[PDB]
Amino acid sequence: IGHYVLGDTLGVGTFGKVKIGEHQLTGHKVAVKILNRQKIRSLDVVGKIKREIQNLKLFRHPHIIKLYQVISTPTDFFMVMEYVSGGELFDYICKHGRVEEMEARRLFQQILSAVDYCHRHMVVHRDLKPENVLLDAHMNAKIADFGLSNYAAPEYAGPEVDIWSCGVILYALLCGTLPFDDEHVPTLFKKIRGGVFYIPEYLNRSVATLLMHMLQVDPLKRATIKDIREHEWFKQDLPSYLF
């Protein structure tokens, strides 16, 4: 409708819908987050969202969805962002299976560097969830920002909760299944609070020591960004442009 033709609805968020936008001349596809101004005013997060968008504009990380422009109308806010073609990562895992060891390490390094970048450059937060991790045309991980615009850890905390989530995403990459999964809801939290997760034969021992630390119950005893950056398995074939 504006600037870019508006097509099919991708999803429906809290502040409003998110649709696809094709270019009227070139055919370039973008993702438009439509945020309702009245809904923002009713939620008393006017300054919170305005400062979040200002912080997202100065964001420059290739494994995070970039914000191009924000068009303002008296009814809604139009966040023009990059369209990630291949949907969610976890959608690919359950449909295809497990990813190879050196390929899962490639995706993990892209995910962790992005998570760390978000915590040191964002005012407001939502805990990271496998919903945020998306896959592009080049099969690279693209993470959505932890803001108001868009199986929890044991145990307010920000990076500590996300490191545990990175451990869940890491497990799913070289296993195909989740580290903790049970049909019964009370026993699911019991496995998490106990840190009991199955370790497969095909899994390496160096990554097993990293996974054990990342999925630690006590957040004080749990691995930090520096702890993972100093680990042998994570350091192997890690690109210099990150961190």
Shortest Å, Cβ 146 to ligand EDJ? 10
Provide the 10 A C-beta neighbour count for residue 155: 15
User: Is 128 a residue that touches ligand EDJ (CB under 6 A)?
Assistant: no
Pick out the residues of the known binding site for ATP: 10-18, 33
* Catalytic residue chosen out of the listed positions 8, 44, 127, 218: 127
d(C-alpha 106, C-alpha 104), whole Å: 5
Q: Which pairing describes strands 133-135 and 67-72: parallel, antiparallel, or unpaired?
A: unpaired
Q: Active-site residue 91, yes or no?
A: no
User: Is 81 a residue that touches ligand EDJ (CB under 6 A)?
Assistant: yes
Pick out the residues of the known binding site: 10-18, 33
Using the CB atoms, write b or e for 11-38: b if 16+ within 10 Å.
Answer: eeeebbbbbbbeeeeeeeebbbbbbbbe
- What binding mask, one character per residue, do residues 86-125 give for ligand EDJ by CB under 6 A, x or -? -xx-------------------------------------
Q: List binders of ligand EDJ among 188-207 (CB under 6 A).
A: none
d(C-alpha 209, C-alpha 196), whole Å: 14
Residues near ligand EDJ (CB under 6 A) are: 10-11, 18, 31, 33, 65, 81, 83-84, 87-88, 132, 134, 144, 150
